[PDB]
Amino acid sequence: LLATVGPTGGVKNRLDIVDFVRDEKFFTLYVRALQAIQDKDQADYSSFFQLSGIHGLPFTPWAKPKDTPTVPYESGYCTHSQVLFPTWHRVYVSIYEQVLQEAAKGIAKKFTVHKKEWAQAAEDLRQPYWDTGFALVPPDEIIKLEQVKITNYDGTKITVRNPILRYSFHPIDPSFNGYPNFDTWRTTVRNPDADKKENIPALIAKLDLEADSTREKTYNMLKFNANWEAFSNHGEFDDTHANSLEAVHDDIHGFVGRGAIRGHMTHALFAAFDPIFWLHHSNVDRHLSLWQALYPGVWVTQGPEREGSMGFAPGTELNKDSALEPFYETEDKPWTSVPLTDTALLNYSYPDFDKVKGGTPDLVRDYINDHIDRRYGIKKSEGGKNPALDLLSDFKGVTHDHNEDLKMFDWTIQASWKKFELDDSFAIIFYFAADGSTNVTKENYIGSINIFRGTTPTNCANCRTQDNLVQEGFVHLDRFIARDLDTFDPQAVHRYLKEKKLSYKVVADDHSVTLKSLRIRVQGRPLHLPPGVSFPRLDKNIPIVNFDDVLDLVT
Ligand SMILES: [Cu+2]
Ligand SMILES: [Cu+2]
Residues 371 and 385 in one domain: no
For 55, 100, 169, 470, the CA distances from 233, given in Å and listed in that order, are 17, 29, 32, 10
Q: How far is the CA of 119 from the centre of ligand 1 (A)?
A: 32
Q: How far is the CA of 55 from the centre of ligand 2 (A)?
A: 8
Of 208, 220, 249, 262, the C-alpha closest to 445 is 208
Question: Any bridge partners for residue 149, and if so which?
Answer: 159
Instruction: Using the 3D structure, point to which of 325, 356, 377 is the last residue of a domain.
Output: 377
Q: How far is the CA of 159 from the centre of ligand 1 (A)?
A: 33
Q: How far apart are CA 81 and CA 236, in angstroms?
A: 10
For helices 200-223 and 277-294, the axis angle rounded to 10 degrees is 20
Of 207, 184, 204, the C-alpha closest to 196 is 184
Q: Is 371 annotated as ligand-binding?
A: no
Resolution (in Å) of the shown entry?
Answer: 3.2
Residues 347 and 445 in one domain: no
Q: How far is the CA of 284 from the centre of ligand 2 (A)?
A: 9
Residue 312, judged by CB atoms within 10 A of its CB (0-12, 13-18, 19+), counts as buried
Determined by: X-ray
Q: How far is the CA of 448 from the centre of ligand 2 (A)?
A: 18
- Find out whether 426 and 451 touch, Cβ atoms under 8 Å: yes
Ligand nearest to the CA of 89: 1
Residues 289 and 302 in one domain: yes
Ligand nearest to the CA of 278: 2
Peptide bond into 171 cis (omega under 30): yes
How many structural domains are present in the chain? 2
Ligand nearest to the CA of 279: 2
Quote the domain boundaries for residue 152: 1-377
Q: How many CB atoms within 10 Å of residue 467?
A: 11
Q: How far is the CA of 271 from the centre of ligand 2 (A)?
A: 7
Q: How far is the CA of 270 from the centre of ligand 2 (A)?
A: 10
Ligand nearest to the CA of 54: 1
Q: How far is the CA of 370 from the centre of ligand 1 (A)?
A: 30
Q: How far apart are CA 282 and CA 15, in angstroms?
A: 10
3 state DSSP class of 456: coil
Q: Is 114 annotated as ligand-binding?
A: no
Q: How far is the CA of 433 from the centre of ligand 2 (A)?
A: 32
Q: How far apart are CA 411 and CA 477, in angstroms?
A: 6
Q: How far is the CA of 366 from the centre of ligand 2 (A)?
A: 30
User: Mind giving me the DSSP string for 292-321?
Assistant: HHHSTT-----EE-SS--SSS-TT-EE-TT
Residue 436: left if φ>0, alpha if ψ -120 to 50, beta else—which one?
Answer: left
Residue 139, judged by CB atoms within 10 A of its CB (0-12, 13-18, 19+), counts as middle
For 124, 278, 412, 422, 536, the CA distances from 518, given in Å and listed in that order, are 48, 32, 16, 12, 30
Amino acid letter, 475: V
Residues 159 and 269 in one domain: yes
Q: How far apart are CA 238 and CA 443, in angstroms?
A: 32
Q: Is 264 annotated as ligand-binding?
A: no
Which helix (H) or strand (E) is 529 found in, with range?
A: strand 519-529
Ligand nearest to the CA of 88: 1
Q: How far is the CA of 80 from the centre of ligand 2 (A)?
A: 8
Q: How far is the CA of 249 from the centre of ligand 2 (A)?
A: 6
Instruction: Using the 3D structure, point to which of 316, 349, 377 is the last residue of a domain.
Output: 377
Alpha-carbon torsion, ordered 369, 373, 374, 375, to 10 deg: 90
Q: How far is the CA of 204 from the centre of ligand 2 (A)?
A: 20
Of 71, 76, 37, 83, the C-alpha closest to 55 is 76
Residues 528 and 543 in one domain: yes
For 29, 54, 223, the CA distances from 273, given in Å and listed in that order, are 20, 10, 32
Which helix (H) or strand (E) is 160 found in, with range?
A: strand 157-161
Q: How far is the CA of 54 from the centre of ligand 1 (A)?
A: 10
Question: Any bridge partners for residue 198, and if so which?
Answer: 192
Q: What is the CA radius of gyration of the chain?
A: 24
Which helix (H) or strand (E) is 257 found in, with range?
A: helix 245-257
Ligand nearest to the CA of 277: 2
Which residues, other chains included, contact 450 with Cβ-Cβ below 8 Å and sequence gap of 6+? Answer: 250, 251, 253, 254, 255, 258, 266, 425, 427
Residues 190 and 141 in one domain: yes
Residues 201 and 292 in one domain: yes
Residues 74 and 220 in one domain: yes
Q: How far apart are CA 4 and CA 94, in angstroms?
A: 7
Ligand nearest to the CA of 55: 1
Which residues, other chains included, contact 332 with Cβ-Cβ below 8 Å and sequence gap of 6+? Answer: none
Q: Is 89 annotated as ligand-binding?
A: yes
Residues 344 and 449 in one domain: no
For 179, 268, 273, 324, 454, the CA distances from 264, given in Å and listed in that order, are 12, 8, 7, 24, 11
Ligand nearest to the CA of 250: 2
Residues 190 and 78 in one domain: yes
Residues 77 and 126 in one domain: yes
Q: How far is the CA of 89 from the centre of ligand 1 (A)?
A: 7
Instruction: Using the 3D structure, point to which of 377, 408, 431 is the last residue of a domain.
Output: 377
- Find out whether 94 and 4 touch, Cβ atoms under 8 Å: yes
- Tally helices (H) and strands (E) across the chain: 13, 17
Q: How far is the CA of 277 from the centre of ligand 2 (A)?
A: 7
Ligand nearest to the CA of 245: 2
Q: Is 80 annotated as ligand-binding?
A: yes
Residue count of the chain = 555
Long-range contacts (CB closer than 8 Å, 24 or more residues apart) made by 335-344: 335/4, 335/91, 337/84, 337/87, 337/299, 337/300, 338/299, 338/300, 340/87, 340/90, 340/91, 341/292, 341/299, 343/285, 343/289, 344/11
Residues 344 and 395 in one domain: no
CATH of the domain at 255: 1.10.1280.10
